[PDB]
Amino acid sequence: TREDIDRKEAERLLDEAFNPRTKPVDRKKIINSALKILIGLYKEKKDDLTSASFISIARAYYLVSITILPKGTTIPEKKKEALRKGIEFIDRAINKFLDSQRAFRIKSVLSIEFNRIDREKCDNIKLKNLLNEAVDKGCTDFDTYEWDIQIAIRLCELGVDMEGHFDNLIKSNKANDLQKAKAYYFIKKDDHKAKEHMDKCTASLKYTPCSHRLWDETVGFIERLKGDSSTLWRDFAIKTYRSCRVQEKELRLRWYWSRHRVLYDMAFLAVKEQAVNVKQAKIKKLAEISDSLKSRFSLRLSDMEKMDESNHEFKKFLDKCVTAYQDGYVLELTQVPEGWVVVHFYLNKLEGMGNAIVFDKCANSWQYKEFQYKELFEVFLTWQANYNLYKENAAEHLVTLCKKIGETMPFLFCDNFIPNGKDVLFVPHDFLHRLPLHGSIENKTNGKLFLENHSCCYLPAWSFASEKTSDEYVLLKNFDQGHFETLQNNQIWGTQSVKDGASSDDLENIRNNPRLLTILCHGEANMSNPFRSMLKLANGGITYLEILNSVKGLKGSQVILGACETDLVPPLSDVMDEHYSVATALLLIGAAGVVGTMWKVRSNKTKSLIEWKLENIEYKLNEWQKETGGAAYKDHPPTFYRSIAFRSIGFP
Amino acid sequence: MNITVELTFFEPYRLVEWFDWDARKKSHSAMRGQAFAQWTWKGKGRTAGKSFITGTLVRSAVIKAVEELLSLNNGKWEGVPCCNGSFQTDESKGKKPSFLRKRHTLQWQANNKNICDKEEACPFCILLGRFDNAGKVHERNKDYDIHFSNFDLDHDLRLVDIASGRILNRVDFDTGKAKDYFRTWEADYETYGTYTGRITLRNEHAKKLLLASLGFVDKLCGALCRIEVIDHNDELRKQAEVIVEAFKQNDKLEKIRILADAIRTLRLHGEGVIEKDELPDGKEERDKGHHLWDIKVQGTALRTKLKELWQSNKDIGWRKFTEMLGSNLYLIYKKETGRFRILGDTEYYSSDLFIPVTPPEGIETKEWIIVGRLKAATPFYFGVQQPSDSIPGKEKLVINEHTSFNILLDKENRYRIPRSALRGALRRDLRTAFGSGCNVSLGGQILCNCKVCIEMRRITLKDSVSDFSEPPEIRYRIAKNPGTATVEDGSLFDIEVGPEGLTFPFVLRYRGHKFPEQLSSVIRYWEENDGKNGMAWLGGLDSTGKGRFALKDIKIFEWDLNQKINEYIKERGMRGKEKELLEMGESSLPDGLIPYKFFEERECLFPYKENLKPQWSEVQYTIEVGSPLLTADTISALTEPGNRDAIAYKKRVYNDGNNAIEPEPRFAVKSETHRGIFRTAVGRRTGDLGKEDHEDCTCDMCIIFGNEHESSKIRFEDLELINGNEFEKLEKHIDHVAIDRFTGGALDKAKFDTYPLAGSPKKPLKLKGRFWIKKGFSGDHKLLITTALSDIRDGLYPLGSKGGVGYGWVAGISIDDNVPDDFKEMIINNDYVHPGHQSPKQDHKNKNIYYPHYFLDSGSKVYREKDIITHEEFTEELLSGKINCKLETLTPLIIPDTSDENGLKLQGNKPGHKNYKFFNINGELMIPGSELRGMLRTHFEALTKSCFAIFGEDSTLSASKTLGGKLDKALHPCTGLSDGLCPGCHLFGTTDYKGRVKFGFAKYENGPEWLITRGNNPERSLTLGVLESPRPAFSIPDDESEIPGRKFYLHHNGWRIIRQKQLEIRETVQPERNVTTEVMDKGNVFSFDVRFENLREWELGLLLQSLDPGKNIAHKLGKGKPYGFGSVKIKIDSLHTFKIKRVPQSDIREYINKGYQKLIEWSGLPQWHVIPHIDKLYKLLWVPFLSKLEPDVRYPVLNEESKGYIEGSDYTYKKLGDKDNLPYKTRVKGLTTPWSPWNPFQ
RNA sequence: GACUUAAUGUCACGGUACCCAAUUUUCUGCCCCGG
Ligand SMILES: [Mg+2]
Ligand SMILES: [Zn+2]
Ligand SMILES: [Zn+2]
Ligand SMILES: [Zn+2]
Ligand SMILES: [Zn+2]
C-alpha cells in the first residue's frame, strides 16, 4: 500500500541516519524527514497503523534522542522526552501484532538509554523485566544486530543470569571490547579475561574522543567495579585515566562529560590506595592525575556552540566531539626550581576528602595529606556570600575563612609537609582556587599567617608553569577617573602605556615583552564560558580568548591586574571552580606572573602595590603583605582584607 | 494567647495541589510549590476543594521577617537583644526540618547577656520555637510557645473558580528562546485573597517582635502581602461542531478557521452586529450571498444560525459568547486539520549549608519603591496558553501545536502585565546592565551570587493590571511561500494583542542598602521622556515589535528602615497602596516615606550608557507610498458592515488622556508585514529564503531575523500611516473585474472591490515606522539590512496586497535624523511596422464596414513549462528591473471611476443613468495598474499563445455543453503547478503562483486633458452608446463551431460618430441602458512603471514587445473599445535592470530578438508577421490613421426598424444572422479574420 | 474543629510562554444581437 512505500522511504532514511558515515548535522535533518513521513503517516492511520511503522517511529525517536546532546551538566529533558516518545510509540507495536522481535529490540534499547539518563522514569526493576521479555522473545541474536549485545550485557549489569547466552556473545564480532569485558566480569565472574578485554577497551579509548558513548560506559563499568568491591577497578581506573590523558592532548579544550570527574576521582583514589621509591612514585602520580584534571577545563556544549585561528580548531574539536557522541549509538612535575615547594591540591568528590600533594624540591620528596573540605567550603561560601554583599565589610568572614584554611589544612603549617623557608607554589583545585591559602592562619593561639614564612605563588594547574624580557613598564588603564590619577603621572610608565581609556587593541599592540604590564580595568565574568570572561577595556573589552589569540607581546612579562578575580571569575554555586581567570590566559600567552587581588579592594591598595612593584619588580609579594597589614588580622581585619587579596599567579 | 491573623493578597498568588510531605516528593509541581498556597481536593470528584496556606509557610515568612527586623536593629527589637537564633539541626541529634533553608541567614552580633535555653530565651528563640515542648513531630498545640495554624481561605469552592492555570517560562538570555516552562496556578486575589489563621503565642516576651514581623512580611505564596491581626460551553461546543460539519458538507472546512477568527473578532462590535444583521451580505451579483455568512448550516444561513446561537446564549454575554464560540470553532478546526514538530517544549521544575550573612554595623538599609505607569508604546502581547489547555487540575504523542494564541488577562478581562513577565524582563535588562549575569539555575543548594541575582533578590515587583478591559485585537500572520510568493497553506496563525497606549501600574520595590546603579539604569532605560523612547520589552513577539513598554510618571520613594521601621510596619510598606502612592503628593506621604531625590539621570548612569542604551538601535523611517496601499484585514472585511471585499488594515489605539480607545482606528502596515518584507528582502539577496529548512541554521537571515532556536536581532514596529488627515477620503473604493478572454466581457462572479488607502504619486501616504537593531550586528549583516531598506525604497517590495497591479508601491523612504550615522551613511522606440490589412488599405474613402471585434483563432498548442521560475531569489542569469513606460492615447480614453456611480452628478435629473468620472486618486487622473496589467496580459497571452486565463466556462449556450467543455482542454486556465504554467500564467501569475511582472498605476502627465464636447452637461463627458453584454452565440452559432479565440477590438475613430450622435443618444436610448463618462482626449500621456523580476531574456523581450509592438500597433484600454475608445500606444521611456543599470537600446533589442526566437521555437530587426498568429494579432491591433485611413467600424443594427442604420446597406443582423444569406462557418471565418469587411462581406 | 501545617532552617519575586512565519496570489469595471 501507500503506507509501505512511505515507511520504506522512512526506513531507508533511518538507515542513512544510522550510518556512522552520516554527519551529525545531516543526521538530524534526515531523522526530521523520516519522522515527517512516519508521523504524518501515523496521523492518517492513527491506531490502525501497522506495527512495522510503529517500530519505525520508535527507531526514529531513538535516533532523535541520539542527536540531542546534553547542552549542560544535566541530561536534557528533550533527550528524555524523545526516548519517552519512542517508548510509547513502540508500545503501540507491542500491543498490536519477527515484528515483535524487532519491536522489543528497539523498545528495550530505548529503555536502556532512558534508564541510564532517567533512573526514576525507567528504574532498574522495570528495565530488567522488559529486558528479560525481549530475551525470551528472541532478542538474543548478537551476530548481526549490535543492539542485542546491549540488551544482554545490560541484563548482566542487572544481575540476570546469562550463562547460556555468553558463548554466542563472545563469538559475535559486533560486541565491543568493553562489552566483552563486561560479559566476562558479570557472567563468567572471571577477572583475567575481563582484564584482557578492558585493557583492549582502554587502549582503544586513547583515540575515541571523550564525548563518545564508550567513555561513559567504561567509567560507569569501573564505578560498578568499585561498588562491587572488586580488585579490577583500581587497575582499570588508572588505565582509562591514562587513555583520557592521552586523548586530552587532542586552547586547553576539554569536552564536558559527567563521568569525567568521577574517572579522575576513581583514578586518584586508585593511586592513593596504592600509595621505597614505588610509594613516592605513586604520590607523584597523584599530582599528575590532579594536574591532568586542572590542565584543561570542561566547556559545556551550549558554551561550545555559543563561542581567528582558534575558531578553526574549536570547530574541528566541537564537530569531532559531537560526531563521536552520536557515533557510539549508530613541564615535568619535578622541574620546580630549587628551594621551592609545590602543593598540588585535589578535591575528591568520590570520597569527601581533599588531598594536598606536596613536592619538596630539596628533598625530592613526595608526600600527601588528606583534609576535609566540606566544612571549609561552607566557610568559604559564608565569606563569598558576605563579600558579595558587604565587600570590605566582610573582612570578618575572611578571617574565619583564613582561620578555616589553617584549621582544615594544618599541614600547611607543619614543617614536615611544608618546610620553613621554602617558597610555596600552590596548585589548588575547585573552590580552593578562590581560597587565600597564603593568608591562612594556623589553628593555634596567635596563629601566624602562611605568607609570613613562605613566599606563595599560585597556578591554576602545574601545566601553566613556564620556562623563561624588556625593561619597559606599560600601564593599560580603562578605569574610572577617580582612581589611579596619581599613578598615571608616574614617569616610569613607557611609551606603550595607554594611561587612560586603554582598549583591547592597546593590549594587543604590546610587542616588546615589557618588564611589567599593569592593566587597570574592570573585570567581567561569563558565568559559563571562561573564554568569554573579559577585561573591561575600551572598544568592547578583551576576552580570555582574545588574549589567547591576539596578545603576543607579553613573553615573560609580569602582569599586574587591577581587576579583582571575583570580577574575572563567576562566584561559586558548587564545589567546582573550573573557571580559569583572565590571568590564566595571560600565563598561556607567556606572562611570567600575574599579580592581582582575589577580591574587590579599594584602588589605593592596588595603586600601593603597583608603586611598590614599580621599584624592584623582583620583590616578593609576601614581604609586602607582611609590612602592609597582612599580619594584622586580629587588630584590623579590613587591613588584613586588603593585603591578603594580592596573590601571584605564575611560576618562573 | 491566641492572635487571629488575616492574610490578604494584593496580586495573584500561586496555588499548588496539596501533597503531604512524603507524597509531595513524587510530584515535581508540588515540590516546586512548597512556598505556595495549598489546595486540597475536598471531594471524590477532583473539582471542588479548599485552599489554605500552611502555618509552616506563614511561620517561615515570619521568621524571615524577624531575621530582617533584627538585622535592621543589629539584633534587638525594642531594646531587648536577640541572639542569632538557630538555623541548623544535626541529623544525628534529631530529624531535619521538613524544609531546609538554602538562603543566607541574616546574623548579627549576639549581645544577649546569657545563652538562650528552656528557662530564658530571647524573643527570636521564642519565635523560632527553639525551647518549647513542640518539636519536629507534632503532638498537640499546647507544646507550642509560638504556634502558627493553617491559614484557611476566607470567602464548595471549585479550583477553576479560585485559580487559573498558567504556564510560566525560563527564557534563555542569549538566544531569547525559552529553555523550559513550568505550570502554576494563579489564584484570584480579588475574590479569594484573604486567608485567616491563628497564631498562638504563650510567651509574651516575643509579642512585640511577632507583631512587628507580621507587619513586615511582604510576600507570601508568590504575591504581595498584608498580614493583619484582627453549562453553556458544552452547548456552544456542540453547536460549533454542527457548524464545522455543515462547512465540511460544503467543502469549506478551511473557512472554519477564518469563521472562528471572525466570530471571535465580533466581540469588538457588540451584540448589535448579530441582532440587527450588520454582517456583510456579499455582492448582489452572487445569488449565493456572502461567502461566509450565507453558508447553509442545517439548512439555514450562518448569519441567522449565529443569531439563534446568540439568542440561546445571551446570559453569558456577548464577549464571552463570541469568544467561546470562536474558540470552540478554532479547536474543532485544529482537531480536524491536525511546520511539523517532532518534540514538544519541556516542562521543567527545580548540600546542607548554613550561610550566616552579617550586615555591617551601622549600614543604612532602605526600601526604595518605584511607582510609575507602564505605557504600551506598541501593541503588546503576553502569551497565555489556550484556556482548554490551562484548566487547573485538568491541564493538557503527536505534537499538534496551537495556531491561535490568546493574550493574558485576569478574570475581569483586564490586560495584565504579570509579575513573572515583568520580573523576567527586569532580570534580562539587569543582566544587560551589569554586563554579566547567570542563566537561572533552578535547584541550586547555594544562592547565586551573580550581581543580577544579588540585586534581583532584593527587587520585588507587582502584578500590573489595566483598568481598560476591552477585547484584544487579533493580529493574523501568514508565512509566504518563498518560491511562489503566495500564502503557505495552513500557515495562517494569529495572536491577540493589547492596544498601544494602554497603561499599567508599575511598582518596583528595592530592599537594600544602596540603590544600585544598574537597577536605576534599567529604570531609566524603560522610562520614556522628551526625546527618548521607553525600552521595556515585556512579553512575547518582541520581534514583531509587540510589547515595547515605556515607564512614565516614575516616582521613587525610600523608606528609612533603620529609623522609620515602625512607620514601615504600620503602613505595611504600602503594599496595596502603591496606586495611591502614585496619585498622592509629597505632603500626603506616610511618615517613613520620603521622595528619593537621588535617582540618577540617564547620562549619569554608566550601566545605561554602555550596556542598555546601545543594546537596541532605533531605525525610524517614513515610507512614501504614492500608490493605493491595501494591507488587507481579511477578518475585518467579514465583520464590518461596509460590504467590502478588501479593506485596509487598521488597529485600535488606547488614549491615556481620554482613558478610552480612540474612536478613529489608525491605519498601519502591520509590524509583521513590515518584518516579513525585510526578511524576504534579506533572504532573497542572501539566498537564505530558498533554504528548505532553518533548524540549527546560522544563515544571514537566521542570524538577523532569528529562528525557532534564536530570537531575532531585529524588531519591527508597525508602519503607522501619519498622513490620514491630509486625505479628504482616505479609504478609496476601487473596483476590479476579470474580463473573459473570449467574450471580451467581465465575468459576473469575478468582480471584486478593494478599499485601499487613497495614496497617489502627487499625494502619497506617509507611513512612519521603525525597527530596532540589536547590538553586535556584523558589518555585513548591517549592510544587509540597509540593502533591504534600500530595496524597499527602490520599490522592489510593495507593501500589502495587490502589488502586481500597482498597490502599495513605495515611492521612497525618508530616514529620520536619529537613525545612527553609520546606518544612514550606507543608504526608445520599436522600429517595427506592421503591413496592416489589405481591405482597409485598398479602401480609399473608407467604404467597407468592419466588425468592431475579431477573435484570435490561435492553435491548441500551449507551452506549459513545469520548471516554474522561483521567487525565492534574484537569479543571476534572469533579469530583474523596472520599465518606465509612457502611455499615449490615440483615441479618447475612458477609465471610469466606478466607485462613484454618480460621479458627474446627473442621476437627479436623469434617474438610473450611470455616470462616472475618469479614474482618479486624490483628484489626479490615473489608469489603475490592474487595467494596464490586464491589457498587457491579454496581449501577452495572445502573443505567446497562452491559456485563456479568464474564461466563463460555466456559461451555457442556446447548447449541449457549456463554454468550458466547448473550449479546448489546453486553453483552459492553468490550475495548480503540478501541470506546467503557460507563458502568460508564468509571467503574470496564477492563484498558485505570484506573477513576475508588477504594473504600477499610470499617472497622468500631460496632454489636452478632457475631450471637450459642446452640448454635454459636463463638457468633459460624453454620453456613450449602450454597452450590451457580448453574445457568444454569434461567435459560436452551432454546436460544432469551437471557441473562435481571444476577442480583440479594432483601432478606429468610431467615437467621432458617438460624439456627433451625442444630442440623439440621450433622447433615443434609455438612460439606464447606457452610461456617460468623463472622457480623456487623444494625445494624453500617462507614465506607468512595469516592475519585473526573475525574467528570462526572452520574457523581458516579449514583454517589451507586448508593451510597444510597433509604429502602427497599439492597445485598446478602458471602456468603449467597440466604439473606438481606448486606442493607447505604449512607448518605453527607459528600461532598467538590477544586478540598477539603464539598459541601452542595443541590449533592449537583443531582449526583443531573444523573445522573437522563443516564439518561432514554439511555432515550430525581427519580423513579427512571419508567425501567423502574431500577424493576425498585430492586424487586430494595427492602428490606421497614424495616414489618410479612417475605416468605419461599427456593429450591425438588429432589424431595419433600428436607429443608426443607413437604408440599402443590408448590414443588419437580420441579414447577417440568417444562415441563408451566409453560412455559419463563413460568419465565424469572417469573425476570426481581422479587418475583414462585413457590409461587403468577404 | 477536621479537611489541612509542622516548628531551631521554604532564595520559588529561583524561571518573561518564549522563540520562528509579508493575509496574501490571481482577476482590464469590461461590453450587441436575439427572448
Ligand atoms: Mg520547639
Ligand atoms: Zn536566642
Ligand atoms: Zn544569578
Ligand atoms: Zn537560516
Ligand atoms: Zn495559463
Author numbering:
A (entry chain C): 15 to 111, 116 to 268, 272 to 296, 303 to 334, 339 to 361, 391 to 528, 532 to 715
B (entry chain A): 6 to 160, 166 to 240, 268 to 375, 380 to 391, 399 to 444, 450 to 880, 899 to 1029, 1391 to 1571, ...
What does the paper say about this structure?
Here, we report cryo-EM structures of the type III-E gRAMPcrRNA and gRAMPcrRNA-TPR-CHAT complexes, before and after either self or non-self RNA target binding, and elucidate the mechanisms underlying RNA-targeting and non-self RNA-induced protease activation. A recently characterized type III-E CRISPR-Cas subtype contains a single-protein effector that exhibits specific target RNA cleavage activity with no collateral activity or cell toxicity, representing a promising new tool for manipulating RNA.
Given that it lacked the type III signature cas gene, the type III-E CRISPR loci contain a gene encoding a caspase-like protease TPR-CHAT, which formed a stable complex with gRAMPcrRNA. To explore how the TPR-CHAT protease interacts with the gRAMPcrRNA complex, we determined the cryo-EM structure of the gRAMPcrRNA-TPR-CHAT complex at 2.6 Å resolution. TPR-CHAT contained an N-terminal TPR domain, and a caspase-like protease CHAT domain connected by a linker domain and bound the tail of the gRAMPcrRNA complex mainly through Loop2-mediated electrostatic contacts with a buried interface area of ~1800 Å2. A DALI structural comparison revealed that TPR-CHAT structurally resembles eukaryotic separase, which corroborates previous bioinformatic analysis that the bacterial CHAT domain is most closely related to the eukaryotic separase, a caspase-like cysteine protease essential for cohesion dissolution during chromosome segregation. In addition, the bacterial TPR-CHAT contained the highly conserved histidine-cysteine catalytic dyad typical of caspase-like proteases across bacteria and humans. The structural similarity between bacterial TPR-CHAT and human separase, including the highly conserved catalytic dyad H585 and C627 (corresponding to H2003 and C2029 in human separase), suggests the potential protease activity of bacterial TPR-CHAT. Notably, as TPR-CHAT lacks an inhibitory peptide, the catalytic C627 and H585 residues were located in a rigid α helix and a β sheet, named C-helix and H-sheet, respectively, and buried by their own residues (D543, T629, and D630) via electrostatic contacts, making the catalytic residues inaccessible to incoming substrates. The TPR-CHAT protease stays in an inactive autoinhibitory state by forming a stable complex with gRAMPcrRNA.
